[PDB]
Amino acid sequence: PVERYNILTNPDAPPTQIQLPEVVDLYNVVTRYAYETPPITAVVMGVP
Amino acid sequence: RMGTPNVSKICNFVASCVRNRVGRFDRAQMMNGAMSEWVDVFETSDALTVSIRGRWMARLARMNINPTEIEWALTECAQGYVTVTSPYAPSVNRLM
Amino acid sequence: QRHITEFISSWQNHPIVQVSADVENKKTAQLLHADTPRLVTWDAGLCTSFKIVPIVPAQVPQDVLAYTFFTSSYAIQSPFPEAAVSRIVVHTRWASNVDFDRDSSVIMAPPTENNIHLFKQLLNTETLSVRGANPLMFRANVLHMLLEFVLDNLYLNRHTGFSQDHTPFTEGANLRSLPGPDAEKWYSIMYPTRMGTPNVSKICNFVASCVRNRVGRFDRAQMMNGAMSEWVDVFETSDALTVSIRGRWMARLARMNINPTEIEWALTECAQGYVTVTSPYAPSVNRLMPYRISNAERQISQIIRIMNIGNNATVIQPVLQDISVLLQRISPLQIDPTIISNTMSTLSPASSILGKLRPSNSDFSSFRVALAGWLYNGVVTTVIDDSSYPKDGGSVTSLENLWDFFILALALPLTTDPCAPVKAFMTLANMMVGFETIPMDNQIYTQSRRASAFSTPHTWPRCFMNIQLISPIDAPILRQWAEIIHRYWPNPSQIRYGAPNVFGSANLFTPPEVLLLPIDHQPANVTTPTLDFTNELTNWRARVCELMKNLVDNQRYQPGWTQSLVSSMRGTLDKLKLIKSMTPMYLQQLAPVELAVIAPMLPFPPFQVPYVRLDRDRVPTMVGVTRQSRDTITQPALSLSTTNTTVGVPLALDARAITVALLSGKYPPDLVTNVWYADAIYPMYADTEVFSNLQRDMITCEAVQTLVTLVAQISETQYPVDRYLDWIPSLRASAATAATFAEWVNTSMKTAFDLSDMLLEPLLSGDPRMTQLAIQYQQYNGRTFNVIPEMPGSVIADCVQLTAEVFNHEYNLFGIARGDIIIGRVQSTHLWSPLAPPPDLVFDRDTPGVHIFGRDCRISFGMNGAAPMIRDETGMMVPFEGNWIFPLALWQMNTRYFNQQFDAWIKTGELRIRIEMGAYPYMLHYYDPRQYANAWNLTSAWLEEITPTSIPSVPFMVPISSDHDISSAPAVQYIISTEYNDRSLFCTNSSSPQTIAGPDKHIPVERYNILTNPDAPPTQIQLPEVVDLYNVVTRYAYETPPITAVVMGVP
Amino acid sequence: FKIVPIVPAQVPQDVLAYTFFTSSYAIQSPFPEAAVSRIVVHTRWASN
């Protein structure tokens, strides 16, 4: 199904365009995050 | 990436697919000694699970708090009996 | 010769000699720690990397075998190689002779042998098979190969003697003698003119045709040592490119030359005239002392040094430690806290403080460290633990806390911390809470807030910022303290340092000749009176003591005391206040003189930034570095300096010990400062390693410049570099890939100079493709200072560009085959060469109906007689016939598939396909024309070796050379090149005077233009098209003296 | 979601050269090679 691979099948098609809910694309551009989740004691220091 | 010596339906479909939409789409790389916090890339996948995860990230992003805010809060709670301190530096991406 | 430096004192019989640490006999002598290569070399052998090889010897009939002179007969021997075909081969410095080796020599095997390892020497390390290399790595490999050739050629030609000759033609004539044996064989090669040519032959005709004048020593220096001239000019076989490169290296040495008298004057200035060193130098005609350099090179090196520190306090600790040891034995002053204890002669507040002090420890390393830190102001920070301050902020009623406060007040001025005044003020406010009131502008920050939290100017309180804003009534003691601090706050100082003639200074954030100090200094005078309140420290101590006395006067601050301690407290404080410590006096005069002497002594130039004692807005916040040129726009990324907020490394030290030292300083009673300092300096001057450090720094600078230029050469960098070999295949490497390739080139360079030490390791973190380095620091108000040095060029880079152009002209001699070849089986009776096949047989590039195929062309398949047809670029499947153009990549992508589709067509099909090759290394195989030849099996093997990652080594089959007509037999070859590639062949059948049959190659007149053409001037070159392999050249002899100083007492 | 193969093709056959089929070399393909195949939901089938 071209609709399921539209991002590749159509060069003119926008990367973010979706065919939902008519067709579920099986090839997608994905954003992966490396944001840190450090402990408060790591950056916040108590001073006597 | 598959080659198409054959004229098979798979070969024809691959030939139809855009050649250039491959590899990391984009990345957060520019600051001195800063690796990309996030990167965009084209790959096989499904948007709907990606959408669910995106909403989860959105809610978590909605709840995030910053270290300076925490320093002020702890110091205020101490009321001068206790003192805590936080440094000032460029955003390094910490989820609180 | 092991001794490089000799020092002799006149007032003591203790001469001192310094030698390189690399020597095997360090008996009672100083050594050279830095790892350093020997850049200058002398050569006993020919600097030749290329030798023509004659493959097959030949025979010509001669009735008489000898020259006719008297009754004797002389045999005829050709210096020229005898072969049906002869071609040059690569062996860098093959004819050179030296004890020391660059260990970078390159020997190239004959075309019949595989040299794939050299072609894939660099990034092709990740190759499935040793045979075969990825083409896109080829450009990087070629560039590195040229670099190695240049490094291997870094030598100087030693002047050599000439000898009377015993060969009959020039018997008794003087011939410069090559080392040991073969000199006559060498003579025959340089002067085949010496060889007679009685028989008639192509070689003989050429020798007879040659001009007699282009031979022998061109000229000699009239000045000479014994029978040997200082310099000479002679005609002999050589390559101009290498000679030119060596000339550039020599030119760099000529610029670097430095003079001893300048050194003597500079040494006297550094000594400040303390002692007279004697360094008169006997003049040397060839005297060489290359020590001329630029402060800009030093700046680049120091930026590298700062990156090398790279946030490691541990690395700085050792230099500071050695410096402190020197200061400890470079100071004749004595510290006596026990004397303070004896003067005291001791519930007692004095007893409490004494128990707290435990003054028994006699170590003052921290004090010396503090002086060293003052020297490195920019990279050094003095910090104090809050725990050093009174627990819980101290208590107004605590006498022990009062002792802590007094010691803290004494060391508070000492702290280099800029916000330290704010912290001390906050500390006093914290103790004062409930007695004096301090207003806070911000609710979040409290009067009891720990001062250490206020480590920065932006946290300085507005109430704190204006004394008038605070009510004097609210905190009158505090108000007075603020006024007194303003009235008596300590003054830091700047002192002149460095010598312009030679060492100079590369200071950027600070004036180059000025040394910054956190302490004001004054002219030295031991006779000065002890009670001088003009001394800042004395005045500060007095004011602080009186202020404390006023505070404790009513005892309002300390209720709960059954007895009044005012009289006793006042006496103890009075004794401390009136102490005539000379430590401030020593720091004011003696410390500056000593620091000034040690500054040249310091191995590493200190890093400092301007001192702003009260300039809060102008206080700098941090220092950062940039790798790219200003014009470029790029993502800002994380850097090591940003992580550390502190500009300088933080140091926390024991306040009590420092305060006690400050209260306990005395000089030796009969000490002669000039004598003590001179005695210490003489050995210290005798042990200096400055020259070696300068040499390593200069090498590092050359490497850095070469690296930036190379980064632009193989990658996208703003720095301009000419690329004529972009045709040479290369991909766009990721920044990481380029960095790894760079790391391999760097390891190669270190091994090439035999470097046991790290090179540019801070530079090896990343961002090799950096257009311009820049470094800057900013103030709390936000003003900033940016320092950018001017790039100094590298001899290697210019030589590289010249060689690159030479390679482009000589790549066939270089052995890489440019262009593509056409696939066509061919059988013929003609004499045309494999490199010169019939053009009509080949379809030319500008031909109609040739077929190129698009990426989408899956071939059609026929089952049970159905018609398979190759999908065309146009998308029409076609039969396997015609002339086609195939991109090389497609075959590698589908090598098995293509072979399968055309295997019958390949073996017997007439279809001709052109695969675009552009350039490639080639392999040559000689073949016999008079016997049946079939490459079809060979072609099948080569195609199978074709693979997606890379393709098999190109095999060429050529006929064996012959000087006479020969029969031929059918031969099948499917490989057809599009061009003649036989320019590498020096000559064919040279033995024959004329060619009976086949292709003919003759000795090149242009390469022998000086001998071949009389009109041509002796110094004429035909580069890059024609390379003469023999030319007139100059060899000279030079002398370098050892460092020697004779030290005498100054009047 | 992962695609699944439903019906195999009638291969090999005498008229059709096996050399024609890429799958005959057992070359890895992006999609299943079969007479019938349909997409299937398999939650976290490839997740780690």
Q: Mark D24-45 as b/e (b = at least 16 C-beta within 10 Å).
A: eeeeeeeeebeeeeeeeeeeee
CB contact under 8 A, A47 and C453: yes
Alpha helices, H only, C756-867: 795-814
Other Cβ atoms closer than 10 A to C573: 20
CA distances to A43, C414, C931, C938 from C928, in Å: 81, 93, 6, 16
Chain A CB contacts of B91 under 8 Å are: none
Partners of D20 on chain B (C-beta within 8 Å) are 6
Q: Which residues contact C375 (CB under 8 A, 6 or more apart)?
A: C323, C515, C595, C598, C599, C602, C606, C608
Angstroms from C450 CA to nearest CA on chain A: 7
Q: B69 near A10, Cβ under 8 Å?
A: no
* Total count of residues recorded for chain B: 96
Angle at the Cα of C1006 from the Cα atoms of C810 and C813, rounded to 5 degrees: 20
The answer to whether residues C820 and C852 touch, using CB atoms and an 8 Å cutoff, is no
Least Cα distance to C985 among C910, C905, C915, C924 occurs for C924
Interface residues of chain A, partner chain C, Cβ below 8 Å: 47-48
* Closest residue, chain D, to C897 (C-alpha): D19
Tell me which residue in A10, A27, A32 faces B44 most closely, judged by beta carbons: A27
**Quoted resolution (Å):** 6.5
Beta bridge partners of C923: C955
Of C450, C634, C858, the CB nearest to B8: C858
Which of B19, B71, B91 is best to mutate for the A interface (most A CBs within 10 A)? B71
- Convert C897-919 to b/e letters by CB count within 10 Å (16 or more is b): bbeebbeeebeeeebbbbbebeb
Instruction: Measure the CA–CA gap between C669 and C333, rounded to whole angstroms.
Output: 10
Test B80 with C855 for CB contact under 8 angstroms: no
Closest CA to C130 of C948, C895, C947, C952: C952
CA angle, C222 then C225 then C227, to 5°: 80
Token code pair at residue D2? 């992962």
In D, which residues are within 8 Å of B6 by CB distance?
A: 20-22
Tell me the C-alpha distance between C647 and C625, whole Å. Answer: 13
Buried b (16+ CB within 10 A) or exposed e, C315-339: ebeeebeebbebbeebbbbebbbee
- How close is the nearest chain D Cα to the Cα of B60, in Å? 22
Sign of CA dihedral B4, B7, B9, B13: positive
Provide the β-strand partners of residue C230: none
- Of the CA atoms within 13 Å of residue C587, those in its CB half-sphere come to 27
CB atoms within 10 A of CB C840: 7
Do A48 and C453 make contact, defined as CB atoms within 8 angstroms? Answer: no
Which residue in A31, A41, A45, A47 has the most chain B C-beta atoms within 10 A of its own C-beta, making it the best mutation to test that interface?
A31
Q: Which residues of D touch C863 (CB under 8 A)?
A: 13-17, 20
Best CA proximity match to C518, nearest among C493, C495, C499 = C493
Contact C449 B75 (CB under 8 A): yes
From the CA of D16, how many Å to the nearest CA of chain C? Answer: 4
On chain B, the residues whose CB falls within 8 A of the CB of A9 are 16-18
Residue C244 burial (10 A CB sphere; 0-12, 13-18, 19+): middle
CB of C880 closer than 8 Å to CB of C870? yes
Closest CA to C609 of C454, C489, C778: C778
Residue of B nearest to D43 (CA): B49
Residue (of C811, C860, C1050, C837) closest to C959 by Cα position: C837
R_g over Cα of chain D: 14
Query: Is D17 within 8 Å of C900 when comparing Cβ atoms?
Result: no
How far D19 CA sits from the closest chain B CA (Å)? 10
Bridge partners, residue C175, by sequence: C163
Total Cβ atoms within 10 A of residue B1: 5
Nearest alpha-carbon partner for C958 in C994, C980, C922, C929? C929
Rg (CA), chain A: 21
Helix (H, G, I), strand (E, B) or coil at C473: coil
Interface test with C, best of D11, D20, D23 (most C CBs within 10 A): D20
Among the listed residues A39, A18, A36, A35, the one whose alpha carbon sits nearest the alpha carbon of residue A27? A18
Q: Do C862 and D13 make contact, defined as CB atoms within 8 angstroms?
A: no
Residues of B in contact with A45 (CB under 8 A): 84-86
In sequence order, which ranges of C579-647 are alpha helices (DSSP H)? 583-588, 590-601, 640-643
The minimum CA-CA distance between C653 and chain A, rounded to whole Å, is 19
The shortest C-alpha distance from B25 to chain A (Å) reads: 7
- Is the C-alpha dihedral spanning C350, C356, C360, C365 positive or negative? negative
Chain A interface with D: residues with Cβ < 8 Å: 4, 24, 26
* CA dihedral of residues C1034, C795, C102, C191 (deg, nearest 10): -30
- Residues in A closer than 8 angstroms to C391, CB to CB, are 48
The whole-angstrom distance between A21's CA and the closest CA on chain B is: 10
Q: Identify any residues that bridge with C18 across adjacent strands, giving them in sequence order.
A: C5, C30
CA closest to B81 among chain C residues: C448
**Determined by which method?**
cryo-EM
Residues of C whose CB is below 8 A from B32: 624-626, 636-639, 642
DSSP, collapsed to helix, strand or coil, labels residue C987 as strand
Q: What residues of chain B have any CB closer than 8 angstroms to a CB in chain C?
A: 3-8, 11, 15, 19, 29-35, 72, 75-76, 79-81, 83, 85, 87-90
Task: From chain C, pick out residues whose CB is under 8 angstroms from the CB of D20.
Answer: 861, 863, 868
Nearest to B67 by CA among A37, C445, C443, C454: A37
Residues of chain A positioned with their CB less than 8 A from the CB of D39: 4, 26
Q: Do B38 and A37 touch (CB under 8 A)?
A: no
| Inter-chain touch C863–D19, beta carbons under 8 Å | no
Contact B74, A44 (CB under 8 A): yes
Confirm if C1049 and C672 have CB atoms less than 8 A apart.
no
Of the candidates A18, A44, A48, the beta carbon closest to that of B71 is on A44
Kindly give the interhelix angle for C365-375 and C655-663, rounded to the nearest 10 degrees: 90
Extract long-range pairs of D9-16: CB within 8 Å, 24+ residues apart.
D9/D33, D9/D34, D9/D35, D10/D35, D13/C863, D14/C863, D14/C864, D15/C863, D15/C864, D15/C866, D16/C861, D16/C863, D16/C864
Distance CA C293, CA C300 (A): 13
Per-residue exposure over C119-151, b if at least 16 CB sit within 10 Å of its own CB, e if not: bbbbbbeebeeeebbbbbbbbbbbbbbbbbbbb
Distance from CA of D5 to the nearest CA of B (A): 14
Nearby residues of C319 by Cβ (< 8 Å), 6 or more positions away: C602, C603, C604
Contact check, Cβ <8 Å, D30/B6: no
Contact D30 B8 (CB under 8 A): no
* H/E stretch holding C737: helix C735-752
Residues D16, C78: Cα–Cα separation, whole Å:
70
Chain C residues with CB-CB distance to A under 8 A? 386-387, 391-392, 450, 452-453
D15 contacts on C by Cβ (under 8 Å):
863-864, 866
Beta carbons of B85 and A47 less than 8 Å apart: yes
Nearest to B17 among A5, A24, A34 (CB): A5
Q: How many A/B residue pairs have CB atoms within 8 Å?
A: 105
- Find residue C1044's DSSP bridge partners: C6
Query: Which chain C residue has the Cα nearest residue D13?
Result: C863
Contact: B10, D30; criterion CB under 8 Å: yes
CA of B58 vs chain D CAs: smallest distance (Å): 21
How far apart, in whole angstroms, are the C-alpha atoms of residue C305 and residue C327?
A: 23
CA–CA dist C1006, C1012 (Å, integer)? 7
* Of the partner residues D13, D20, D25, the one whose CB lies closest to the CB of residue C861: D20
Torsion of CA C618, C620, C621, C624, to 10 degrees: 140
Residues in chain D whose Cβ is within 8 Å of chain A: 1, 39
